[PDB]
Design a binder for these strands. Structure first.
Ligand SMILES: [K+]
Ligand SMILES: [Mg+2]
Ligand SMILES: [Mg+2]
Ligand SMILES: [Mg+2]
Ligand SMILES: [Mg+2]
Ligand SMILES: [Mg+2]
Ligand SMILES: [Mg+2]
Ligand SMILES: [Mg+2]
Ligand SMILES: [Mg+2]
Ligand SMILES: [Mg+2]
Ligand SMILES: [Mg+2]
Ligand SMILES: [Mg+2]
Ligand SMILES: [Mg+2]
Ligand SMILES: [Mg+2]
Ligand SMILES: [Mg+2]
Ligand SMILES: [Mg+2]
Ligand SMILES: [Mg+2]
Ligand SMILES: [Mg+2]
Ligand SMILES: [Mg+2]
Ligand SMILES: [Mg+2]
Ligand SMILES: [Mg+2]
Ligand SMILES: [Mg+2]
Ligand SMILES: [Mg+2]
Ligand SMILES: [Mg+2]
Ligand SMILES: [Mg+2]
Ligand SMILES: [Mg+2]
Ligand SMILES: [Mg+2]
Ligand SMILES: [Mg+2]
Ligand SMILES: [Mg+2]
Ligand SMILES: [Mg+2]
Ligand SMILES: [Mg+2]
Ligand SMILES: [Mg+2]
Ligand SMILES: [Mg+2]
Ligand SMILES: [Mg+2]
Ligand SMILES: [Mg+2]
Ligand SMILES: [Mg+2]
Ligand SMILES: [Mg+2]
Ligand SMILES: [Mg+2]
Lengths: 148, 140, 191, 97, 166, 15, 26, 95
RNA sequence: GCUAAACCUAGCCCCAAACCCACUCCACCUUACUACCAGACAACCUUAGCCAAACCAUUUACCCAAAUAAAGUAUAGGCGAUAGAAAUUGAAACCUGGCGCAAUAGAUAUAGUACCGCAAGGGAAAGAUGAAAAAUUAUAACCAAGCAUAAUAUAGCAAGGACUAACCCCUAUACCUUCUGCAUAAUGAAUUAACUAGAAAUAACUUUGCAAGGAGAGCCAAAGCUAAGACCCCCGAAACCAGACGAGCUACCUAAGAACAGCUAAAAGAGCACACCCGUCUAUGUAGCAAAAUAGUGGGAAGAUUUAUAGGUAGAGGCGACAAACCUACCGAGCCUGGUGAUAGCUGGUUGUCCAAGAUAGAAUCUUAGUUCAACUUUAAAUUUGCCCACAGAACCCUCUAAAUCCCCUUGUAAAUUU
RNA sequence: CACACCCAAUUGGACCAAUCUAUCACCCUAUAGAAGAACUAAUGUUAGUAUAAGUAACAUGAAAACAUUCUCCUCCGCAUAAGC
RNA sequence: CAUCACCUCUAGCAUCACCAGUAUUAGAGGCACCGCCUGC
RNA sequence: AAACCUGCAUUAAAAAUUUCGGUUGGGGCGACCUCGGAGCAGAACCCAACCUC
């Protein structure tokens, strides 16, 4: 503990206190970096590399329409409605090597990702899910046990 | 679980055993004895240097005492036995001075003879040959 | 340790009865300064850092770690010739002396752990034979654990138990990460 | 002084009683039982400690909000003081910040 | 508490061989919880230490200390016990072998001082122990003379060696 | 220089 | 009374050593 | 800083850090310059140029701000059209 | 060998479970524990403050009825310290148990008794034979300090090296703590036994499991995730507040009483002078007879006197011929309990072994008895240069003028930088 | 001949007494787990006993047959009230 | 310090102090009798 | 008509909470606290507080 003082006596000042001068975390001006952070919408990205990886291993069947339920069933994405998630966004990463004809529904989609799917003869659609409905889509079984 | 020291008796007997020969309360009171036993152990470690130092001083006194019986000084004996390539330490020389008086007188005579050769050598300019006992054996 | 609950608890200087009064004035008495008679320094006072029970030591290892512990426990028993497979637990007699002599003849060991598939299908012959014994225990397949296996020198399993264990244990090796606890309905669970 | 002059009575321990021979049984009730039961549900003890672990401050806070309405007046008063002391100690005293 | 001195009288020795010398009789007696200071008692026990049984009584009879009467009563009952129980032919033959005092169980009282102060007064008690040995008292050690001093000094000069050598 | 007086402490009588 | 056997056992052996010194056997 | 709350028993977050600093998921903290809205009439254009820019905190300040915020502010977010989205991961960084 | 030393129960702690007790006769709100006469009196009303903010003045957590999660999130706030939801989600729930204590422990408890205080209130200490005490011929031996057994012989931190040998010879300035530096004549310790002081998060590291997935819902993830291990003390103020308890001492008052010889004098807050009250001077005493007394000498002693009895005024106050007097032998604000384990940048203390690395640039600060950052130091890791240094090179001034320093290939070396 | 074996604060290690528990062991140990887990020091707490110290201090008028008498003091005494 | 004496200030009145009173009174204060001198 | 009570304002009374920033042996009287330059570290950088201007 050292020689005397607040250190040895366990009466050290609070974290961020600088001995009396204006603390660093206080002398900085306030800017709206994180203002309204809990009301911004978040979308888990879904790469075509990931989508092709799931199709080749059979985890996501391309023979049936693909929605957010099937992606969660194949453990392709992890959606957390409690964390202000509103679905998945289809990103254009790996669009060059994507080769599959699927009917996938994603909440958001980039212009390039739409073109890549429609090039192979597939169909891509964007639909909206409210936070209450989103938790039902991801885990239907826990909702079916609520008797509602 | 409450833990208590059950063998604290043996923890103090390992210190009080070294103090049984002390005087006063510092032979039976652990608080007093521990400070005296530690000092006794500190003196024990530091006395190994004085023991070696005191032995050599005692040897020098005994060598000097025996040298004066032959009319020699300690610098004259040790200095001139070295120049004869006689590497006898003080411990042996003191033993020879006590138990081999005729052998010590032989070394005193040898040192005295070698001492006189150096004085004769310093008088000359190097032309004269070195003394008989002044010869040095070389090792290659 | 996980199911251990430690109930040891002592009273701090705030929980010892009395001791709200300062014994003697701060200066003048010529004695040491004290503020209460129940401080840890005082006889009969509180404990500075004592147990504050009840305390829980509960923690959960990952499910695969606990399932892998069973496989290693089973592997160690078989590798050391302490595991014996059976077809059924039906004894000719319900005499507990018969079971002891049967285990000594085959040189099983001082303690033998007997495992059945279920609890309601255990034959009455082995139930009466083991209930009066102290080192020969009878447990269902679901009651298998590493501590019981390590405590007992010899492990005895039936054919249904072996099939039950492999189905249960190998399910951990190739399974999806749980979306929700497996107690809820799934597509293909239970097997 | 402080050490007994006679040996204490021998401590005979029965290593194969009902409780020791059956210790650890059913600890795999979930994995081997289709996850209908949980191994933490086997735990017995205070209702505020079953399947939960925390430090002294958390144990007092959890105990107060679950069985606080059933505690005796003197016991509840002591619990409130302990929470007040532990709050000040943990959040204002220590070596690290 | 310890009462070993009483038990020291109950030890019985094996019968002696005909060629063995006569064993002096040893009598261990004591009185417990005497209301007297052990420090003051020591002077009386030191006085009669080594004396004869009759000589010890004479010194105690004309001594003004309170313990002198107490010790004399102990010697009389110890002299009677030796003849009655310890098979001693002559009661006067006994002499004092061991005579010492010991601390006894003490009480504690409060002694009041001025200014509301007080001290802790103890009511001191002592034990007196006496041992009697049959036979005449041993002659006192003669004082060391010049011949004894000279003989010892020369012996020291003869036992010295040459140290720190072979 | 205020007069400071420390009252004597009487020990319990049972001792 | 402090729980523990090792300290009590160790003290008995020390006492036996003292008994030998006080009253040595033939 | 409240290391253990009185109702939940868990660490709290100092809200004076959230309203002033931005944490990139890589570990960096982004702040403003003290005085970028004060007395701009007496400052040179070069001085004002480096005042209205966002800067990074150092090693000590970043460590300080990590202890004053909980894990909810250190998680990875996927905000749609976030201005700082590309800054959440380091590129070609060694040691 | 005395004093002593040892012992295993009494009982207790924490849980579970279940919702507990109080009429045998007599007495008991008046002065409780008192057989037996006209009352009319009636209860309810925000806590505060300590403390934190390194002051303090707004503010500062205190079960309110489901564990978990949402979430320390939305919000609140000298927008500082800190405080903090909800919608929503949703589990088990078998008293008879103990890696609880064993007489300085566990409840204070053998007992709220003894004892202390007017009261509120505070609050102990301790017991130990054996199957048999209707066996006391007992219940061996050994163990702290203290003693006895057994006083002492030049000289000296009381020991060490030794020695034939205790001493004599030689060598050696007690310990802890606090300071630049303690033999220090600075602090603490008579001594023995028992008791008495490092509690935890994020991150990182280490070792397993699984792996673009991890986890026994929730959460994280651009190799992560899960689990474990591993880091944050003790004693001490003067205080402040709330609620009680105290005017049997004392301050003043109320009720109804009592006392004051003799003499000179006169219808006297007169004089002398007893009882009585007070306490001027000196001496004794100073753990005393006495937490304010004794002896002598003194002031008053028919008055604003002294005094017995009962009652009243109570602490944000009372009372006061104001001495900041007195209000139950610490009154510039009583005492007790509670808040309270108040707080203390201050003092003191901080308990096994062994090894290893390891000291002096500063800045800011209601700051210099402190803290924060840097420097220095440590550990782990990563990487490649690090130190030493050949020339070359680094300003003119006010006219001139030092030891040197920076930089620095070789070379000698093994470190340095970064995480 | 041996060789980790002479710095404050701090930091990194390797060992470890006693205790409880799991399993061993069975004249007192082993491997682990856990913790009220180690005292020459806080004018520490309690208890015992020293030192000062057998010191300071304290006490009973005389003779006698223990009938009595003598010497001296009396600023006390007896009762009520209050208290006990 | 209090104290007669002096002086200042406040108050025109009742059913619990002042008070069962009424400005020749009551309260809050200064000063310390008296006598002489003085302000206005 | 008037009063009482209540709410909200305005004075006054009596109180309530809280604090005494540092530097210059002390007090009094004054000065001082941030920034720039010199005496001021002669030659890379830094560095002489107090003090003098
Ligand atoms: K303060
Ligand atoms: Mg310091
Ligand atoms: Mg208390
Ligand atoms: Mg108090
Ligand atoms: Mg206190
Ligand atoms: Mg206790
Ligand atoms: Mg802390
Ligand atoms: Mg008195
Ligand atoms: Mg404060
Ligand atoms: Mg202050
Ligand atoms: Mg007790
Ligand atoms: Mg007690
Ligand atoms: Mg002894
Ligand atoms: Mg000497
Ligand atoms: Mg001295
Ligand atoms: Mg000094
Ligand atoms: Mg002292
Ligand atoms: Mg206040
Ligand atoms: Mg204050
Ligand atoms: Mg009165
Ligand atoms: Mg008169
Ligand atoms: Mg008069
Ligand atoms: Mg008066
Ligand atoms: Mg005055
Ligand atoms: Mg004054
Ligand atoms: Mg008082
Ligand atoms: Mg404190
Ligand atoms: Mg300070
Ligand atoms: Mg080193
Ligand atoms: Mg070496
Ligand atoms: Mg162990
Ligand atoms: Mg401890
Ligand atoms: Mg001790
Ligand atoms: Mg001590
Ligand atoms: Mg004296
Ligand atoms: Mg005297
Ligand atoms: Mg008399
Ligand atoms: Mg006057």
């Amino acid at each position: 503990r050292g020689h005397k003082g607040e250190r040895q006596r366990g009466t050290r000042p609070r974290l961020g206190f600088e001995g009396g001068q204006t603390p660093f975390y206080i002398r900085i001006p306030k800017y709206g970096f994180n203002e309204g952070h809990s009301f911004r919408r978040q979308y888990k990205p879904l790469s075509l590399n990931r989508l092709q990886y799931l199709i080749d291993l059979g985890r996501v069947d391309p023979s049936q329409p693909i929605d957010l339920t099937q992606l969660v069933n194949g453990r392709g994405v992890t959606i957390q409605p409690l964390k202000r998630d509103y679905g998945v966004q289809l990103v254009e990463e790996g669009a060059d090597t994507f080769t599959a004809k699927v009917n996938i529904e994603v909440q958001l989609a980039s212009e390039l990702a739409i073109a890549a799917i429609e090039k192979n003869g597939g169909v891509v659609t964007t639909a909206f899910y409210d936070p209450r409905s989103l938790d039902i889509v991801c885990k239907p079984v826990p909702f079916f046990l609520r008797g509602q | 679980l409450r833990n208590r020291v059950t063998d604290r008796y043996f923890r103090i007997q390992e210190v009080l055993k070294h103090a049984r020969h002390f005087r006063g309360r510092k032979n039976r009171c652990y608080r007093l004895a521990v400070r005296t036993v530690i000092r006794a152990f500190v003196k024990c470690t530091k006395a190994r240097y004085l023991k070696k130092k005191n032995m050599r001083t005692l040897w020098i006194n005994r060598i000097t005492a025996a040298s004066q019986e032959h009319g020699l000084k300690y610098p004259a004996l040790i200095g001139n036995l070295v120049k004869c390539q006689v590497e006898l330490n003080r411990k042996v020389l003191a033993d020879l001075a006590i138990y081999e008086p005729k052998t010590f007188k032989s070394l005193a005579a040898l040192a005295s003879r070698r001492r006189h050769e150096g004085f004769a050598a310093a008088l000359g300019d190097g032309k004269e040959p070195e003394g008989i006992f002044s010869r040095v054996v070389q090792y290659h | 340790n996980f199911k251990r609950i430690s109930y040891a608890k002592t009273k701090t200087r705030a929980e010892v009865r009395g001791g709200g009064r300062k014994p003697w004035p701060q200066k003048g008495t010529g004695r040491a300064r004290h503020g209460s008679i129940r401080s840890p320094l005082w006889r009969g006072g509180g404990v500075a850092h004592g147990p504050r029970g009840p305390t829980s030591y509960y923690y959960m290892l990952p499910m695969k770690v606990r399932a892998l512990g069973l496989k290693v426990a089973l592997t160690v028993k078989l590798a050391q010739d302490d595991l014996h497979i059976m077809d059924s637990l039906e004894l000719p007699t319900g005499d507990p002396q018969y079971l002891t002599e049967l285990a000594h003849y085959r040189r099983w060991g001082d303690s033998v752990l007997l495992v059945d598939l279920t609890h309601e299908e255990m034959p009455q012959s082995i139930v009466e034979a083991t209930s009066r014994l102290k080192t020969f225990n009878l447990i269902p397949a679901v009651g298998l654990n590493v501590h019981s296996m390590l405590k007992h020198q010899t492990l005895v399993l039936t054919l249904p138990t072996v099939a039950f264990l492999e189905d249960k244990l190998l399910w951990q090796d190739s399974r999806y990460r749980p979306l929700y606890p497996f107690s809820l309905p799934y597509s293909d669970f239970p097997r | 002084i402080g050490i007994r002059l006679t040996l204490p009575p021998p401590k005979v321990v029965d290593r194969w009683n009902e409780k020791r021979a059956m210790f650890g049984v059913y600890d795999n009730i979930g994995i081997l039982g289709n996850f209908e039961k949980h191994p933490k549900e086997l735990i017995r003890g205070p209702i505020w400690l079953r399947g939960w672990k925390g430090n002294e401050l958390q144990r007092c806070i959890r105990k107060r909000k679950m069985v606080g309405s059933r505690m005796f007046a003197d016991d509840l008063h002591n619990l409130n003081k302990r929470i007040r002391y532990l709050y000040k100690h943990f959040n204002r005293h220590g070596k690290f910040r | 508490i310890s009462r070993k001195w009483e038990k020291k009288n109950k030890i019985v020795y094996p019968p002696q061989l005909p060629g063995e010398p006569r064993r002096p009789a040893e009598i261990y007696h004591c009185r417990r919880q005497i209301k007297y200071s052990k420090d003051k008692m020591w002077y009386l026990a030191k006085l009669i230490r080594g004396m004869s049984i009759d000589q010890a009584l004479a010194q105690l009879e004309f001594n003004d200390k309170k313990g002198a009467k107490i010790i004399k009563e102990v010697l009389l009952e110890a002299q009677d016990m030796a003849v009655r129980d310890h098979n001693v032919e002559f009661r006067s033959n006994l002499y004092i072998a061991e005579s010492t005092s010991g601390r006894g169980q003490c009480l504690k009282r409060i002694r009041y001082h001025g200014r509301g102060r007080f001290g802790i007064m103890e009511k001191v008690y002592c034990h007196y122990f006496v041992k009697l040995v049959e036979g005449p008292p041993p002659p006192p050690e003669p004082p060391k003379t010049a011949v004894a001093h000279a003989k010892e000094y020369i012996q020291q000069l003869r036992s010295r060696t040459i140290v720190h050598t072979l | 220089t205020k007069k400071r007086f420390t009252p004597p402490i009487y020990q319990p009588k049972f001792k | 009374v402090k729980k523990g056997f090792r300290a009590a056992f160790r003290f008995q052996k020390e006492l036996e050593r003292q008994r030998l010194l006080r009253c040595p056997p033939p | 800083l409240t290391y253990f709350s009185a109702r939940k028993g868990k660490r709290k977050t100092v809200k004076a850090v959230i309203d002033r600093f931005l944490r990139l998921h890589c570990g960096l903290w982004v702040r403003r310059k003290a005085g970028y809205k004060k007395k701009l009439w007496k400052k040179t254009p070069a001085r004002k140029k480096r005042l209205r820019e966002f800067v990074f905190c150092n090693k000590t300040q970043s460590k300080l701000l990590d202890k004053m915020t909980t894990s909810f502010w250190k998680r990875r977010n996927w905000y749609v059209d976030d201005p700082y989205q590309k800054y959440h991961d380091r590129t070609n960084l060694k040691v």
